[PDB]
Design a protein around this ligand. Sequence first.
Ligand SMILES: COc1ccc(S(=O)(=O)N(CC(C)C)C[C@@H](O)[C@H](Cc2ccccc2)NC(=O)O[C@H]2CO[C@H]3OC[C@H](OC)[C@H]32)cc1
Ligand SMILES: [Cl-]
Ligand SMILES: [Cl-]
Ligand code: NA
Lengths: 99, 99
Amino acid sequence: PQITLWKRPLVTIKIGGQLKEALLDTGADDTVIEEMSLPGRWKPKMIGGIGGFIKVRQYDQIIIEIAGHKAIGTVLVGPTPVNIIGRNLLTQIGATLNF
Amino acid sequence: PQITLWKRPLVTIKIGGQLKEALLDTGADDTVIEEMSLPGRWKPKMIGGIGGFIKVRQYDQIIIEIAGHKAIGTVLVGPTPVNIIGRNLLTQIGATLNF
Ligand SMILES: COc1ccc(S(=O)(=O)N(CC(C)C)C[C@@H](O)[C@H](Cc2ccccc2)NC(=O)O[C@H]2CO[C@H]3OC[C@H](OC)[C@H]32)cc1
Ligand SMILES: [Cl-]
Ligand SMILES: [Cl-]
Ligand code: NA
């Protein structure tokens, strides 16, 4: 699709068997999802943004379906105020910025 | 242009006669730039990001060039970790997300 930016670019994602709403976010290096359980090993990480850093759990090799497109990669899980799809998974679905 | 997301989508902007680097950020409702001087009055705004909230200075109707495209609109000034071009000005330069 072609998504205009008059409003937040929100899409439906499926992760760990759950549907969620998430923001397609070109300013995010990494994908960050609100607290949930995911299978396998994880390790602790700090990520920042406006207002400071949060502690998250880093899970690798997680499959997510993003607006119908499957992608695999690292997902960070923690107390983010919004689910964010960052560039690590936007590249895999072939997303580009055009103007 | 068409900008892929394998690297941060950084562009040059021109504001107050100064060149700066900024991130094209579809996850940002608003444009936020590092402390600098701008003309006119400002108004208070609270904005919320991954770590929490910061206070910023809201300047309206500021002239700003983004990757060679002219925009005139609201610019927030405060302690952001990186200069961010949000949807308020991405729409003025005609940006869309495509996959
Ligand atoms: C290391 O990997 C990551 C590191 C950092 C981030 S981030 O969330 O902190 N952020 C990085 C930016 C700030 C350098 C991604 C942003 O797109 C973030 C994504 C975002 C969106 C909403 C809530 C929280 C975070 N957006 C904002 O902080 O937007 C601010 C400014 O405009 C307002 O609109 C939305 C926010 O108002 C709520 C305000 C994500 C992944
Ligand atoms: Cl990854
Ligand atoms: Cl590509
Ligand atoms: Na894993």
